[model samples]
Target chain A: MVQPEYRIYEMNKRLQSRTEDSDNLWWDAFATEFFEDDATLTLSFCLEDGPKRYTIGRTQIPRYFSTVFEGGVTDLYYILKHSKESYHNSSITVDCDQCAMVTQHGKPMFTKVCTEGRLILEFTFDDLMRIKTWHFTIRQYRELVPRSILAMHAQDPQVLDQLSKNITRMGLTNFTLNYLR
Target chain B: QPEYRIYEMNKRLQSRTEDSDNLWWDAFATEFFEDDATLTLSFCLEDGPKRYTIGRTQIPRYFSTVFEGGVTDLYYILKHSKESYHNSSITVDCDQCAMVTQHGKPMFTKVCTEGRLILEFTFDDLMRIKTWHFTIRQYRELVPRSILAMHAQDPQVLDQLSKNITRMGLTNFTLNYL
Candidate 1:
């Protein structure tokens, strides 16, 4: 839809934002709509490490392809790293709920998608650049919500916008809720 | 030389290709790179976009792949080529294959601003994009292969008419049947 991912949780949380919190703006939408079907979307990073760990808001989604095409993997790192792009002095970090590093064959590959954290890849930027033989993933990550949970939500369909209202909650904290706003 | 080709054939006929051997590349006096068989052309990166185009001598080292691979790279080279243009898709068909072979490359030239960008590529450049449709396609920006589609299919067998259709002619568009 014409929306970002983090918006999904606006229903229950309330708090002002921070630069660190604002980076979740495009959360995961880029993972789907913003890209072509190349399946190379290394949605290597995931929310398991951050606020996206909380709810399925539009703003909280991934900018998988957008961030990469617009910038390199380091840009992707900054997207996850910087709290705000439109502002100043936002803290930078590679610390996410999860992280990943991919290489095409032996050559390292990067985009904004540096996640794959579940593996503790410690895959550094040096490793990415030194890569000569690049690798790729054929299938990309789809919606963050599982099909089953989605189907259940789809069943109630109509005022679907309020969907986030009844949506399952994760990471109980006021910070997570407003961070997406 | 430069030219344009258009086709409206079915998939079966379109699949048929003949080996030009070195005929087309050689038929003309590609002087920029060959001035005298001493290909003065060498490979290098472009300004910022990292894409190049075809014009003369320096054959840019990325041309053959555009033809062998498909129009995907062509699309990229043309659009990202320079500060001069931008578009979404291009329609190219070797509609005049035999005609061009007989009449020569320049004769079929479609004299429009958005001339068929004959991008230059070397064997290595072609090998680099060997994974694309002409292989300008990408994955996350860090990669350029396909998903779901297996091997050759994943290689993206695009029609030569791939990439953006640059309407350098400053005309508006409308819905019309072919």
Candidate 2:
């Protein structure tokens, strides 16, 4: 079990500042391919507080892209509030590739925001006859965010800046503001 | 017209002896005797899993006498015995042959390969004498621990294997090679 720590916030920050296209590219490169036919991606987002949990799934990429670009921070605020209510003190496991990609790329895209909370993410797929499962806790989430963010910053500053500005307008702060302390 | 039935008892037996061959007639014979010679012979049902036990003492020495000759042909007698025991017999005739034999007559003249004389019996008759004595050879391979470890993970099923070893008896146990 991964202990609750500050990494969740850092990861969320980096994710908020990266473009959806860049995020998608990263996923295309890193995410395990389980389906051969045009991949069916599932995105699940959950926020928990105590025993209550709020969860939702986006079955396709288009819906997820729309939710992040058009829905704005209000959509996220509602999701966070719902998460707190549905999963109070209970852990939320999002079992979708899109959710994993979003959570994994959170720091670069700057859409994932949680203030001092614990989060756990799991990714799984069938590799041939065997089932492969990968896990990373909120702590590891934060650590990965910085490396991804720095790499993106070094590679393409303009895209990273655009992501940051969009995230700020959506009411999210930078990685430093979110995770420092 | 009246039907006529003829009951014929055919006995065909043949054998060959090599000048250099040393025959054993007692216990503790060499492995060559067990492998090359007929250590035991019995009649059993043809196409049956069971073998009828005919004690060694029951075999007549006259049969051995015929074997000491280079080779002999008993013709239809062998076929009649086989058919009486519910078995089919084939008779192969050869001239001056003294080595390997097929069906009921000699085939090859050399003593390089051991000869065989087949006696057929019915499935029902074989069940009546249900006993057989033969060496059963088997071999087992032991798996190494390193090979097992490389393929399996922690919390494997083999971890719970039984480890208890104990014995309870009034007499002491001893181990020795026979």
Candidate 3:
């Protein structure tokens, strides 16, 4: 059986590359081999107006992350400052400290936005080692985005509706917009 | 090793009901913490986490201050705990633990600010806690609701809330939300 630590390391490595190519090889294998058909991903965004989001089914993974990979954004990265993992009771828990998400590739409105937080991820595996449940907790998220994005949020009348609609597509509440900007 | 660690943790968390309750907070650290034990607390929106080392006497002071001013009878309703061994070292992960007062009331309630109390305890071969990492992530909307609830029920709880918020440097957001 593949160790949970190795799985997370591989997943993180593939995530950066997958931001560029959705059909990345490692992710393709994970979806086919490591993930169960009924796998679920639950994201808990703490201290934000964002509701806890749940994305069910292995096939829904691409759709759930489409928001991040949309608009040809390929340079986004998750930097692991510190990480620890332990396995117990058919589940593996990984705690990442001071993790950061950064991007330098540009859109006209923004250039680079680095967000830092702590993350705790739990994965339950079946007897065959296929992942059944993935629980992700994002704590104390603090980010700095371009001032223009905040301006668009404050000044534009249609921006809020658009923002809400996009998040809604991801199965999140509109109040979550307050934290993203 | 897991049994010993769990026993000690439960004993410490279940303190304050004993005769020497005042020293329970101190015992929580001085009892099993290594001389080089460190506590990294990320309580607010600071540049980085605040570190407290046992040798520096900061860890005990912080805990005692917490016991003295706020959260008299603290109880950790642990939801899940998992321990792993790496040769002589041990790492314990306490996931999604709930923190509540003795009254079973949450530290901050109203849509419930009781979840996401993550505690990571790591010990050396000597069975001494080398690192204790603690953090809480409360919902943004719950802060104001909690304050208003405390205002109506018992204003004394407000003192505890204010003291903790000030200590954690959360007054800015607490005031901004409320």
By TM-score, who's the top model here? 3
lDDT of 2 by residue, A40-144 (tens): 332122323433222223223333333443333321211111111112133323322111122211322323332223323422222221112222122111111
DockQ of 3: 0.02
Q: Which stretches of candidate 1 lie over 4 Å from their true place?
A: A1-64, A67-181, B1-18, B24-81, B84-178
Indicate the TM-score of model 2: 0.16
lDDT of 2 by residue, B65-171 (tens): 33443332221111111112333322222111112111112211111111222422213311211121221121111111222233222223322211101111000
lDDT of 1: 0.21
Every model's TM-score: 0.18, 0.16, 0.35
The per-candidate TM-score of the B chain, in the order shown, comes to: 0.21, 0.18, 0.55
Candidate 3 segments whose C-alpha is farther than 4 A from its true place: A1-3, A19-30, A46-51, A103-105, A115-118, A124-130, A140-181, B1-178
Interface RMSD per candidate (angstroms):
20.5, 34.3, 14.7
RMSD of each: 22.4, 34.5, 13.4
Indicate the residue-level lDDT of B13 in model 2: 26
